[PDB]
Write a protein that binds this ligand. Structure first.
Ligand SMILES: C[As](C)(=O)[O-]
Ligand SMILES: [Zn+2]
Length: 184
DNA sequence: ATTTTCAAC
């Protein structure tokens, strides 16, 4: 049915390590893009896809998604509601590529939730996030409900509830403030 | 378990 999953789900320790939202965490070299997609076609039942992309034919996760979407998914006369949950926000090359992809495809609507802001203090990365926002993508910080959603849908949770870590809300508030300063 | 965000010299 609509249970189609692209890629592999994370084990719990991989999720907890990668989606930790301390603004300056060390040793998180991977980029995880979880996604859900609503496929809306006028005379068909609405269908759903979800999955997980990582880095690397070499490719950052955001580009891996776009390349898979264009090559395997994107159809005529179909609307797409896409939500991303990324562990790191995009680099400027990825941000520019996603922005240009969205300009090319009016039928695709993208919402980006991000656990952390990658190089938020660098103006080239700020510009990248700004251009993403200006081309119609809503960029947001992952909060409690978003981490809980990912735990439920992209993790081998083994029916255990999401356990939020200490500092999750404080970190969210710091990051959301920095994001609003960037998008101003 | 008052079932892990917040409880802040
Ligand atoms: C967060 As990246 C370095 O895959 O654009
Ligand atoms: Zn990139």
């Amino acid at each position: 049915e609509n249970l189609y999953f692209q890629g592999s789900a994370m084990d719990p320790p991989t999720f907890t390590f990668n989606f930790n939202n301390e603004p300056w965490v060390r040793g998180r070299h991977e980029t995880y893009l979880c996604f859900t997609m609503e496929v809306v076609k006028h005379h068909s039942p609405v269908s759903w896809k979800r999955g997980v992309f990582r880095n690397q034919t070499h490719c950052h996760a955001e580009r891996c998604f776009l390349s898979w979407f264009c090559d395997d998914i994107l159809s005529p006369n179909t609307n797409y509601e896409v939500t991303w949950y990324t562990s790191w926000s995009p680099c400027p090359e990825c941000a520019g590529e996603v922005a240009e992809f969205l300009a090319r495809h009016s039928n695709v609507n993208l919402t980006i939730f991000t656990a952390r802001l990658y190089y938020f203090w660098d103006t080239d990365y700020q510009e990248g996030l700004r251009s993403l926002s200006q081309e119609g993508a809503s960029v947001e910080i992952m909060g409690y409900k978003d981490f809980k959603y990912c735990w439920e849908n992209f993790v081998y949770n083994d029916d255990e509830p999401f356990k939020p870590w200490k500092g999750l809300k404080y970190n969210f508030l710091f990051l959301d403030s920095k994001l609003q300063e960037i998008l101003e």
